[PDB]
Write an enzyme that holds these catalytic residues in place. Structure first.
Site, PDB file in Angstrom:
ATOM      1  N   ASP B  25       0.804  -1.220   0.000  1.00 29.59           N
ATOM      2  CA  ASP B  25       0.000   0.000   0.000  1.00 29.59           C
ATOM      3  C   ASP B  25       0.838   1.271   0.000  1.00 29.59           C
ATOM      4  OD1 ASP B  25      -1.944   1.965   0.595  1.00 29.59           O
ATOM      5  OD2 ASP B  25      -2.843   0.839   2.135  1.00 29.59           O
ATOM      6  N   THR B  26       1.035   1.853  -1.182  1.00 29.47           N
ATOM      7  CA  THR B  26       1.842   3.060  -1.247  1.00 29.47           C
ATOM      8  C   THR B  26       1.254   4.293  -0.583  1.00 29.47           C
ATOM      9  OG1 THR B  26       0.971   3.670  -3.434  1.00 29.47           O
ATOM     10  CG2 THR B  26       2.881   2.226  -3.385  1.00 29.47           C
ATOM     11  N   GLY B  27      -0.053   4.267  -0.293  1.00 32.93           N
ATOM     12  CA  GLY B  27      -0.667   5.441   0.360  1.00 32.93           C
ATOM     13  C   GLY B  27      -0.596   5.472   1.904  1.00 32.93           C
TER      14      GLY B  27
HETATM   15  O1  LIG Z   1     -11.976   2.075  -2.633  1.00 26.85           O
HETATM   16  C1  LIG Z   1     -11.871   2.120  -1.420  1.00 26.85           C
HETATM   17  N1  LIG Z   1     -12.685   1.428  -0.596  1.00 26.85           N
HETATM   18  C2  LIG Z   1     -13.912   0.741  -1.050  1.00 26.85           C
HETATM   19  N2  LIG Z   1     -14.285   0.624  -2.348  1.00 26.85           N
HETATM   20  C3  LIG Z   1     -15.591   0.230  -2.376  1.00 26.85           C
HETATM   21  C4  LIG Z   1     -16.533  -0.006  -3.398  1.00 26.85           C
HETATM   22  C5  LIG Z   1     -17.860  -0.360  -3.053  1.00 26.85           C
HETATM   23  C6  LIG Z   1     -18.261  -0.491  -1.698  1.00 26.85           C
HETATM   24  C7  LIG Z   1     -17.344  -0.273  -0.639  1.00 26.85           C
HETATM   25  C8  LIG Z   1     -16.002   0.092  -0.947  1.00 26.85           C
HETATM   26  N3  LIG Z   1     -14.891   0.417  -0.195  1.00 26.85           N
HETATM   27  C9  LIG Z   1     -10.854   2.975  -0.733  1.00 26.85           C
HETATM   28  C10 LIG Z   1     -10.300   4.078  -1.421  1.00 26.85           C
HETATM   29  C11 LIG Z   1      -9.301   4.864  -0.810  1.00 26.85           C
HETATM   30  C12 LIG Z   1      -8.861   4.536   0.486  1.00 26.85           C
HETATM   31  C13 LIG Z   1      -9.428   3.438   1.181  1.00 26.85           C
HETATM   32  C14 LIG Z   1      -9.042   3.097   2.597  1.00 26.85           C
HETATM   33  N4  LIG Z   1      -7.618   3.229   2.918  1.00 26.85           N
HETATM   34  C15 LIG Z   1      -7.284   3.901   4.040  1.00 26.85           C
HETATM   35  O2  LIG Z   1      -8.163   4.146   4.856  1.00 26.85           O
HETATM   36  N5  LIG Z   1      -6.013   4.311   4.293  1.00 26.85           N
HETATM   37  C16 LIG Z   1      -5.655   4.703   5.666  1.00 26.85           C
HETATM   38  C17 LIG Z   1      -4.366   4.125   6.220  1.00 26.85           C
HETATM   39  C18 LIG Z   1      -4.031   2.767   6.032  1.00 26.85           C
HETATM   40  C19 LIG Z   1      -2.869   2.232   6.616  1.00 26.85           C
HETATM   41  C20 LIG Z   1      -2.043   3.065   7.390  1.00 26.85           C
HETATM   42  C21 LIG Z   1      -2.372   4.414   7.578  1.00 26.85           C
HETATM   43  C22 LIG Z   1      -1.498   5.257   8.449  1.00 26.85           C
HETATM   44  O3  LIG Z   1      -0.318   5.024   8.645  1.00 26.85           O
HETATM   45  N6  LIG Z   1      -2.146   6.278   9.036  1.00 26.85           N
HETATM   46  C23 LIG Z   1      -1.624   7.085  10.147  1.00 26.85           C
HETATM   47  N7  LIG Z   1      -2.364   8.035  10.755  1.00 26.85           N
HETATM   48  C24 LIG Z   1      -1.624   8.515  11.803  1.00 26.85           C
HETATM   49  C25 LIG Z   1      -1.846   9.481  12.802  1.00 26.85           C
HETATM   50  C26 LIG Z   1      -0.846   9.719  13.761  1.00 26.85           C
HETATM   51  C27 LIG Z   1       0.376   9.007  13.738  1.00 26.85           C
HETATM   52  C28 LIG Z   1       0.644   8.031  12.756  1.00 26.85           C
HETATM   53  C29 LIG Z   1      -0.335   7.761  11.779  1.00 26.85           C
HETATM   54  N8  LIG Z   1      -0.418   6.899  10.720  1.00 26.85           N
HETATM   55  C30 LIG Z   1      -3.530   4.950   6.986  1.00 26.85           C
HETATM   56  C31 LIG Z   1      -5.027   4.651   3.250  1.00 26.85           C
HETATM   57  C32 LIG Z   1      -5.514   5.910   2.476  1.00 26.85           C
HETATM   58  C33 LIG Z   1      -5.394   7.204   3.256  1.00 26.85           C
HETATM   59  C34 LIG Z   1      -4.119   7.800   3.422  1.00 26.85           C
HETATM   60  C35 LIG Z   1      -3.976   8.985   4.187  1.00 26.85           C
HETATM   61  C36 LIG Z   1      -5.114   9.576   4.786  1.00 26.85           C
HETATM   62  C37 LIG Z   1      -6.392   8.983   4.618  1.00 26.85           C
HETATM   63  C38 LIG Z   1      -6.534   7.798   3.853  1.00 26.85           C
HETATM   64  C39 LIG Z   1      -4.500   3.518   2.390  1.00 26.85           C
HETATM   65  O4  LIG Z   1      -3.367   4.021   1.722  1.00 26.85           O
HETATM   66  C40 LIG Z   1      -5.563   3.105   1.397  1.00 26.85           C
HETATM   67  O5  LIG Z   1      -5.050   2.189   0.478  1.00 26.85           O
HETATM   68  C41 LIG Z   1      -6.683   2.399   2.118  1.00 26.85           C
HETATM   69  C42 LIG Z   1      -6.240   1.169   2.947  1.00 26.85           C
HETATM   70  C43 LIG Z   1      -7.359   0.211   3.284  1.00 26.85           C
HETATM   71  C44 LIG Z   1      -7.903  -0.612   2.260  1.00 26.85           C
HETATM   72  C45 LIG Z   1      -9.005  -1.444   2.551  1.00 26.85           C
HETATM   73  C46 LIG Z   1      -9.541  -1.454   3.858  1.00 26.85           C
HETATM   74  C47 LIG Z   1      -8.989  -0.648   4.877  1.00 26.85           C
HETATM   75  C48 LIG Z   1      -7.896   0.190   4.598  1.00 26.85           C
HETATM   76  C49 LIG Z   1     -10.425   2.658   0.576  1.00 26.85           C
END
Ligand SMILES: O=C(Nc1nc2ccccc2[nH]1)c1cccc(CN2C(=O)N(Cc3cccc(C(=O)Nc4nc5ccccc5[nH]4)c3)[C@H](Cc3ccccc3)[C@H](O)[C@@H](O)[C@H]2Cc2ccccc2)c1
Lengths: 99, 99
Positions: B25-27
């Site tokens: 997961d690059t995001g």
């Molecule tokens: O199509 C999507 N869905 C879907 N289609 C559908 C069609 C029909 C019906 C239902 C559907 N449903 C969809 C599209 C975009 C993003 C996501 C959800 N999505 C995240 O939610 N994420 C948080 C994420 C994941 C892993 C680690 C972290 C992280 O480190 N965070 C962090 N916060 C902090 C605060 C303080 C200190 C340290 C911290 N570290 C964050 C990031 C994106 C993101 C990045 C930044 C900000 C917001 C979002 C990941 O990149 C993403 O790929 C992905 C990861 C993921 C994938 C699946 C399930 C759960 C998670 C889903």
């Protein structure tokens, strides 16, 4: 180009006459953008992430230019913390992962 | 290997004696795994995502083998829907994005 991941892989997009930055996100199935002005009809959708689920407006057939590259697809507009380009568009600009 | 994005980029990991599948997961800045038995000491942390924030346990200096590649890093264990390898480990196995 090639992007290492020591930083967030951010790109500029142009969408709906507006310029934005967005993460290239291989984990995301769909593209989701922060709330913004798009012309047209949309339908409500619910999507899931970490943290739970959100409700978004789905727009189909939207032209996005990501880097220079144009693509057309579905975009979801909704309360995300960050604009994310998901696999639906990454596929169209020919993006790969390599390790 | 090069991975195209027409399907989710899933990989096998071995961690804590156990075999799992995980999304590259690059995001994601951090790596987040579903609930599992790790030994050791951990700290509470909260992270955010699309959908809200969740509380996780942070473990440092844990060995993961992702494909046949070893990495040591922080892993967060918690109620994600899917195991996610984030950029903190992606940089150690040499992962790159290319378009
Ligand atoms: O199509 C999507 N869905 C879907 N289609 C559908 C069609 C029909 C019906 C239902 C559907 N449903 C969809 C599209 C975009 C993003 C996501 C959800 N999505 C995240 O939610 N994420 C948080 C994420 C994941 C892993 C680690 C972290 C992280 O480190 N965070 C962090 N916060 C902090 C605060 C303080 C200190 C340290 C911290 N570290 C964050 C990031 C994106 C993101 C990045 C930044 C900000 C917001 C979002 C990941 O990149 C993403 O790929 C992905 C990861 C993921 C994938 C699946 C399930 C759960 C998670 C889903």
């Amino acid at each position: 180009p090639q992007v290492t991941l020591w930083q967030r892989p951010l790109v500029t997009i142009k969408i709906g006459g507006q310029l934005k930055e967005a993460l290239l996100d291989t984990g995301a199935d769909d593209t989701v953008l922060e709330e913004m002005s798009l012309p047209g009809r949309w339908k409500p959708k619910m999507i899931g992430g970490i943290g739970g689920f959100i409700k978004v407006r789905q727009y189909d057939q939207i032209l996005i230019e990501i880097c220079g590259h144009k693509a057309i697809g579905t975009v979801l507009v909704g309360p995300t913390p960050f604009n994310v380009i998901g696999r639906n568009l990454l596929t169209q600009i020919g993006c790969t992962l390599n390790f």
